[PDB]
């Protein structure tokens, strides 16, 4: 995760270095919106379910 630009939508940096713009899912609260966090999207859906400690 790189930055959060607004509510319910943010940007996420992929492993290859390219930054991705993906709307986050509504079920996830604002606790997972930490700027320096280990976010994990899906391999196809590219949606985040939970972050890793």
């Amino acid at each position: 995760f790189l930055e959060a630009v607004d509510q319910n939508t943010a940007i996420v940096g992929s492993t290859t270095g390219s930054n991705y713009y993906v709307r986050i899912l509504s079920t996830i609260d604002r606790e997972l919106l930490k700027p320096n966090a280990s976010v994990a999207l899906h391999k196809h859906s590219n949606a985040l379910v939970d972050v890793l400690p």
């Binding site: 609260d29 604002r30 196809h44 859906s45």
Partner: protein, 287 residues
């Protein structure tokens, strides 16, 4: 110069054969042939669908062996399968379901006999297991560029044809390449045989075996899930002790996306298994 509103009938035969063929849908190009019967102009029904052996060349007109095709078709003619071929299908993994120049060339060569020439491309590789939405493809005439593209009546089903609304492939390559709607059909034998077969696929053999397993596991294993369930309940109540302060201060607006209600409702639903199975133990003990 005439056109109608055609619709491809898809039963569970071709569907499940495209699902096993999708499991065998390796990155290597695969080949298949669809069969059926043409009853009128604007309807097409598929019944028989089989697979073809793979080749190093892949999808091509040279890979289609006419003596093997006609041999298997003749072996279907000596059996109870008096249906002629209606089209050919394949898989396009990774690069999208669109058709390359070779595919449109072998489609142009294979459409000389059948005017319809139904084409279906299955791609279960990147498609999630939630939806199995599949689409059938068609070939447009090159001489129709002056007149309207598709003079197809009954424009109601186009709303159902607008579900594949990818912003690159459909209208990214829609020129000289359109599609057609897909509907299904299910008789009572498939409905009751497959319905009872799936309910039984989620049920037991005698249907009385694994009931007492959980009825008596409520005392051994579920007790741990009940203690942990109470640990989550108290783990939320420790914050619910702090909630009446904020609710006693602001009372305006909601900032916490957590509801703290439906999760506890679900905990009660998992806790009601003891109540629902207590009567089961009462029946097993009674008679």
């Amino acid at each position: 110069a005439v056109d109608t509103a055609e619709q491809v009938y898809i039963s569970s035969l071709a569907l499940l054969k495209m699902l096993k063929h999708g499991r065998a849908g390796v990155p290597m190009e695969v080949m298949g042939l669809m069969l059926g019967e043409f009853v009128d102009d604007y309807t097409v029904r598929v019944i028989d669908v089989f697979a073809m052996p793979q080749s190093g060349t892949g999808v091509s007109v040279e890979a289609v062996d006419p003596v093997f095709q006609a041999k298997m078709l003749d072996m279907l003619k000596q059996t109870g399968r008096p249906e002629m071929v209606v089209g050919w299908y394949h898989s396009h993994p990774g690069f999208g379901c669109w058709l390359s120049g070779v595919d449109i060339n072998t489609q142009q060569s294979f459409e000389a006999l059948s005017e319809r020439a139904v084409a279906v491309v299955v791609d279960p590789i990147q498609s999630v297991k939630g939806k199995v939405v599949i689409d059938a493809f068609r070939l447009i005439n090159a001489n129709m560029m002056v007149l309207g593209h598709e003079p197809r009546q009954t424009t109601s089903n186009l709303g159902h044809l607008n579900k594949p609304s990818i912003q690159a492939l459909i209208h990214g390559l829609n020129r000289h390449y359109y599609s057609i709607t897909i509907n299904y059909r299910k008789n009572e034998l498939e409905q009751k045989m497959l319905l009872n077969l799936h309910k039984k696929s989620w049920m037991e053999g005698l249907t009385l075996q694994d009931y007492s397993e959980h009825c008596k596991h409520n005392e051994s294993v579920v007790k741990e899930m009940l203690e942990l369930a109470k640990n989550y309940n108290k783990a939320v109540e420790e914050e619910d002790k702090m909630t009446p302060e904020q609710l006693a201060i602001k009372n305006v607006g909601k900032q916490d996306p957590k509801r703290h209600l439906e999760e506890h409702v679900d905990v009660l639903m998992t806790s009601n298994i003891v109540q629902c199975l207590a009567a089961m133990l009462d029946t097993v003990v009674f008679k």
